[PDB]
Amino acid sequence: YYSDDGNYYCLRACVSVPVSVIYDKETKTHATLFGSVACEHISSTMSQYSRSTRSMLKRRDSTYGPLQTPVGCVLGLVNSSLFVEDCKLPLGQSLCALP
Amino acid sequence: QLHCSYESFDVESGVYSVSSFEAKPSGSVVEQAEGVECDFSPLLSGTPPQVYNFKRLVFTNCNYNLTKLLSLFSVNDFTCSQISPAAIASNCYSSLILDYFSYPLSMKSDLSVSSAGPISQFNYKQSFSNPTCLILATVPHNLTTITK
Amino acid sequence: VPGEMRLASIAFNHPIQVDQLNSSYFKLSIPTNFSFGVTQEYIQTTIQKVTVDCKQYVCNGFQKCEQLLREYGQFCSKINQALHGANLRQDDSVRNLFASVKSSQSSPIIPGFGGDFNLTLLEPVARSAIEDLLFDKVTIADPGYMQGYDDCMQQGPASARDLICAQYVAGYKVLPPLMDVNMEAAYTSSLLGSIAGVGWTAGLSSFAAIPFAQSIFYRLNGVGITQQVLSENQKLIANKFNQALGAMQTGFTTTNEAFHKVQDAVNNNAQALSKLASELSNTFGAISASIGDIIQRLDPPEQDAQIDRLINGRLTTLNAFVAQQLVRSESAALSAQLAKDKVNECVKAQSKRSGFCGQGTHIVSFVVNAPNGLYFMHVGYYPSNHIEVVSAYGLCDAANPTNCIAPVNGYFIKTNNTRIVDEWSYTGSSFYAPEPITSLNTKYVAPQVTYQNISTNLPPPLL
Amino acid sequence: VPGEMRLASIAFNHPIQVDQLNSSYFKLSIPTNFSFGVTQEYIQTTIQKVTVDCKQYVCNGFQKCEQLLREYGQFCSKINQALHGANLRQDDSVRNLFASVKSSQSSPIIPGFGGDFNLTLLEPVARSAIEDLLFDKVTIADPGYMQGYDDCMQQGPASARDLICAQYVAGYKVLPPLMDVNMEAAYTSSLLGSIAGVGWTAGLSSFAAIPFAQSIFYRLNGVGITQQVLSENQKLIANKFNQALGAMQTGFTTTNEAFHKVQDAVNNNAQALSKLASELSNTFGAISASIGDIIQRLDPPEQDAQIDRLINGRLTTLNAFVAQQLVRSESAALSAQLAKDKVNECVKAQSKRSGFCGQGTHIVSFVVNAPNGLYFMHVGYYPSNHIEVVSAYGLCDAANPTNCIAPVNGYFIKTNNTRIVDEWSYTGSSFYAPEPITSLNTKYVAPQVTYQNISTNLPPPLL
Structure with missing residues (x-):
């Protein structure tokens, strides 16, 4: 838009943060991925928001910071730096998610 | 949500897609034409008319601030009929009309739409079909373009 | 309480490295152990065959429907014809498959078939116990046909929850397979009777009629394992x-x-069946999903507005349903062709191609019946404990350069074995098995610069 | 300026005619020159993997949609589950493909690998430069993930136009590929090291570990070129x-x-992505394609009718979209199977099939990474300068009528060469090059009336 103050400004509308979760049925536990968003925009609680709670993540993640990955920022993933052939929960890339 | 989507209390393991964050709203930003401005500058110069010779300005489609307009005089009478004097300044209307004339404060007892005085009898009257007001005020020493 | 999930790198296994080497000799990698092992595959060959009554899916013969539907009656005819053609294709593929399954001759099969090998796949004479294990682990609803209609009906347990009873509500019909499980069992035993074997020329005329163990020994010589090791x-x-x-x-x-x-x-x-059943309760903007209910409650000028909303939606789901069936039927036909190809290759012959069959070279494979398809399993050979050895491209007589030989199905390696006085030894290609070089294991070849110049003794040629 | 278009007949290339001949001898057509040449193929193996938010595509979380969409919430589950299964199949095909790609052992890769051959496919130790030439030629929008969202977000150029960052507005998500491209490159590095052995039996477990040049000569003797010519x-x-x-x-x-x-x-x-995006502006007869517009322009009883109309068309495009993706994913899986077979035949070994690869017999082929698939190239052999020569079914003694012979991987020809005193000569099937007839080039066969009756001198048998 051209504003009537003589400056062009322009509009990107807004974007949403894609989300997915890891579900480990055998232990009945979970962890999450915020897509490509990066942990600069991630916080312990959400001001946006997609759902009324984040507390199921907080059951273990109240004590931990967000972690960056090659796909993007995640919660509760723990950097173990292990090398495993197939986690059955792969995140794509070289990323993996051990039970 | 996943349990509901699979209508089960035991969903198979794996990675699943869930709804995205809506992000969030902020303070609004609005642009629209400004400054149209309801005329009101003729009142500040020359000699005002005798009350029977009062001068009128009709205003439509325009922007105003009567409380700013009235800070140009000391007001010794601020009254109205069928509208509070405060409300007429803040209320929007299809039109705004102003009459002005010189008027001594000594005659203020005679200025009402209901007054028994000769001013209401022969000099100036206002309709009861519209909200109306009457103002008495005097000129500041810094309005040198006003004459008497 | 369980620990947090752990981030990890995906491992990448590295191949054993073997250095390339210049000059007239080179490193050679050879396994020193092996194990048998198996792989399995399921190839679907059919889609369950169904038909749909095109009157009953829309309504129950209520007469407002009966008359209104006449305007759309040609669509039902198209639906029935399409379904009918789809079912014919399913039966065509069955006959075509069986034409390759049959053999002009086969061995009789008795207990103790296959000698010392256990062969638990043999029938409990009966469908094989392995086929029954598969059928027991499968979670499929109990079958129709007999008693069929009376397993819907109150003359049976109150706990049945079969879609087969819903067949008689929805107007569905499940057609029986053409193949007949008893005849199918005869076909799978006939395939077992063609074993022993794949060798001894093409095998497309003659029938060897020999014991299984002998055919195994034949196959193992076919992959370069020496006969001496096998014995x-x-x-x-x-x-x-x-x-x-x-x-x-x-x-x-x-x-x-x-x-x-x-x-x-x-x-x-x-x-697929459950989807059509659920749509019977789906209002299409009609006041109710029941036709009799909307007839009872409505003046006839408005009554059939509601009926037509219902009719149109019922027809729409049938159209989608037929399209889904046609696609599945075609993919099944292609899948059936693949199964036929494996029967005429992976089962009827040993193969050197890799690819097809389990990945461990190839040795005999078997096939059993599975619902809607064939289930294959493959015996395979897995190498282990690889070592590197010195080897030569060939050998020649230093006294006469035109006398040059090279190994047949094996390699010439420097000997590391105390039994052999000769400096070089023959080995099998699939297993480490040094042996003296003999004329049986070698062939004459044109001379080449990388062949060794042997200054002493060769039995092949003697001179 | 250009002239008029020219109508022309399609040319028909006539095959070189070769005369059929009467009696015991015949003309043989054989090339006297050749050239290497290449062909290439692309086999797609994957579909981009995507998901979509089933509420965000439909609405922006406006409250009337939040209430109205609930009636259709079960459709969203059907949509998501179908997409989820489709993405699982994509990952399965990748894992299966890689299981056949890997080898138990390989050569190390070095600079200068392959000797005198250029081998420009070698890694810049990496992905090969040839793979990067392909990636430069590709016009695809830049990938997300990292930095991802921050390159979508307003901290970037105002001129970005990528559809990849528009996904975030629409709620589309592009899933990352199952395997990191460097690991994919590592798989093809192991394929380059899997060359040599190529033959040497089936090659299934042993690894010859010999120079590339030597394996080429081995393949050239596989088509009958004599070693003398090759040297x-x-x-x-x-x-x-x-x-x-x-x-x-x-x-x-x-x-x-x-x-x-x-x-x-x-x-x-x-x-696929642009199709869904264009539908975001597609009103379905609703007063506006935007929900917020109809909220501002309509009283809520009116507003909700327009919202339902808008929702229904949006759901229909999602349903159509899923069906198309299911079709595409299936074709990708089938194509992956085709690629697997070529890897297990045409890459890992020389093939006698004809058919697959360039039409010039077969010699070694290579594969490199490509977007959505594998890119193959095939070296092939192209004959040239064909001549016709006199040839015969076999030659054997009239003096020893029960002793005959026939050529191996070549044909007997009347000699046209001044170095050979013998009236007959032997040449290879792939290339014209006369040579003396020797026992290495012959085999004993039963006698036949069409063999020439030789009254003079043959070394095979001498007597």
């Missing part, structure tokens, strides 16, 4: 083979992908 | 081979059909 290890071979055979009892888990595929073939058939 | 022309052969390899630098053009297929695969994925 020394005959009991070892049977033990390793039966260890792999015993592992089949752990083959019915959700981690076995072939097993998982069998279960999803069943799930897909049941799912 | 004379070794530098020439590598030079012709390298020129054929050098043509790959011009191979990345729009007239190359394999290249064109890669470009189409890129825009098949783009087409």
Whole structure:
């Protein structure tokens, strides 16, 4: 838009943060991925928001910071730096998610 | 949500897609034409008319601030009929009309739409079909373009 | 309480490196151990065959429907014709498959077939016990046909929850397979009777009629294992083979992908039927999903507005349904062709191609009946404990350069064995097995600069 | 300026005619020259993997939609589950493909690998430069993940136009590929090291670990070229081979059909995403395609009717979209199977099939990574300068009528060469080159009336 103050400004509308979760049925536990968003925009609680709670993540993640990955920022993933052939929960890339 | 989507209390393991964050709203930003401005500058110069010779300005489609307009005089009478004097300044209307004339404060007892005085009898009257007001005020020493 | 999930790198296994080497000799990698093992596959060949009554799916003969539907009656005719043609294709593929399954001749089969090998796949004379293990682990609803209609009806348990009873509500019909499970069992035993074997020329005329163990020995010479090793290890071979055979009892888990595929073939058939059933209760903006209900409650000028909303939606789901069936039927036909190809290659012959069959060279494979398809399993050879040895491209007489030889199905390696006085030794290509070089293991070749110049003794040629 | 278009007949290339002949001898057509050349193929193996938020595509969380969409919430589950299963199949095909790609052992890769052959496919130790030439030719929008969202977000140029960052507005998500491209490159590095052995039996477990040049000569003796010819022309052969390899630098053009297929695969994925995006503005007869517009323009009883109309059309496009993706994912799986077979035949070994690969017999082929698939290239052998020569079914003694012979991988020809005193000569099937007839080039056969009756001198048998 051209504003009537003589400056062009322009509009990107807004974007949403894609989300997915890891579900480990055998232990009945979970962890999450915020897509490509990066942990600069991630916080312990959400001001946006997609759902009324984040507390199921907080059951273990109240004590931990967000972690960056090659796909993007995640919660509760723990950097173990292990090398495993197939986690059955792969995140794509070289990323993996051990039970 | 996943349990509901699979209508089960035991969903198979794996990675699943869930709804995205809506992000969030902020303070609004609005642009629209400004400054149209309801005329009101003729009142500040020359000699005002005798009350029977009062001068009128009709205003439509325009922007105003009567409380700013009235800070140009000391007001010794601020009254109205069928509208509070405060409300007429803040209320929007299809039109705004102003009459002005010189008027001594000594005659203020005679200025009402209901007054028994000769001013209401022969000099100036206002309709009861519209909200109306009457103002008495005097000129500041810094309005040198006003004459008497 | 369980620990947090752990981030990890995906491992990448590295191949054993073997250095390339210049000059007239080179490093050679050879396994020193092996194990038998198995793989499995499921190839679907059919789609369950169904038909749909095109009157009943829309309404129950209520007469407002009966008259209104006449305007759309040609669509039902198209629906019925399309479904009919789809079912014909399913039966065509069955006959075509069986034409390759049959053999002009086969061995009789008795208990103790296959000699010392366990062969638990043999029938309990009956469908094989292995086929029954598959059928028991499958979660499929109890079958129609007999008693069929009276298993819907109150003359049976109150706990039945079969879609087969819903067949008589929805107007569905499930057609019986053409193949007949008893005739099918005869076909699978006929295939077992063609074993022993694949060798001895093409095998497309003559029938060898020999014991299974002998055909195995033939196959192992076919992959470069020396005959001498095979004779020394005959009991070892049977033990390793039966260890792999015993592992089949752990083959019915959700981690076995072939097993998982069998279960999803069943799930897909049941799912399609359930979709049509659920749509009978789906209002199409009609006041109710029941036709008799809207007839009872409405003045006839408005009554059929509601009826037509319902009719149009019922027809729409049928159109989508037919299209879904046609696509599945065509994919099944192609899948059936693949199964036929494996029967005419992976089963009827030993193969050197890799690719097809389990990945361990190839040795005999077997096939059994599975619902809507065939289930294959493959015996295979897995190398282990690889070592590097010195080897030469060939050997020649230093006294006469035109006398040059090279190994047949094997390699010439420097000897590391105390039994052999000769500096070089022949080995099998699939196993480490040094042996003296003899004329049986070599052939004359044109001379080449990289061949060794041997200044002493060769028995092949003597001079 | 250009002239008029020209109508023309399609040319018909006539095959070289070769005369059939009467009696015991015949003409033979054989090339006297050849050139290496290449062909290439592209096989798509994957579909881009995507998911979509089933509420965000439909609405922006406006409260009336939040209430109205609930009636259709079960459709969203059907949509998501179908997409989820489709993405699982994509991952399965990758894991299966890689299981066949890996080898138990391989050569290390070094600079200068392959000797006199140029081997420009070698890694810049990496992905090969040839793979990067392909990636530069590809017009695809830049990938997300990292930095991802911050390159979507307003901290970037105001001129970005990528559809990849528009996904975030629409709620689309592009899933990352199952495997990191460096691991994918590592898999193809192991394939380069899997060359040699190629033959040497089936090659299934042993690894010859010999120079690339030697494996080429082995393959050339696989088509009957004599070793004598090969030894004379070794530098020439590598030079012709390298020129054929050098043509790959011009191979990345729009007239190359394999290249064109890669470009189409890129825009098949783009087409799918753009289709859904265009529908976001598509009113369905609703007063506006925007929900917020109808909220501001309509009283809520009116507003909700327009919202339902808008929702219904939006759901329909999602349903159609899923069906199309299911079709595409299936074709990708089938194509992956085709690629697997070529890896297990045409890459891992020389093949006698004809058919697959370039039409010039077969010699070694290579594969590299490509977007959405594998890119193959095939070295092939092209005959030239064909001549016809006199030839015979066999030659054997009239003095020893029960003793006959026939040529091996070649044909007996009347000699036209001044160095051979013998009236007959032997040449290889793939290339004209006369040679003395020797026992290495013959085999004993039963006698036949069409064999020439030789009254003079043959060394095989001497007597």
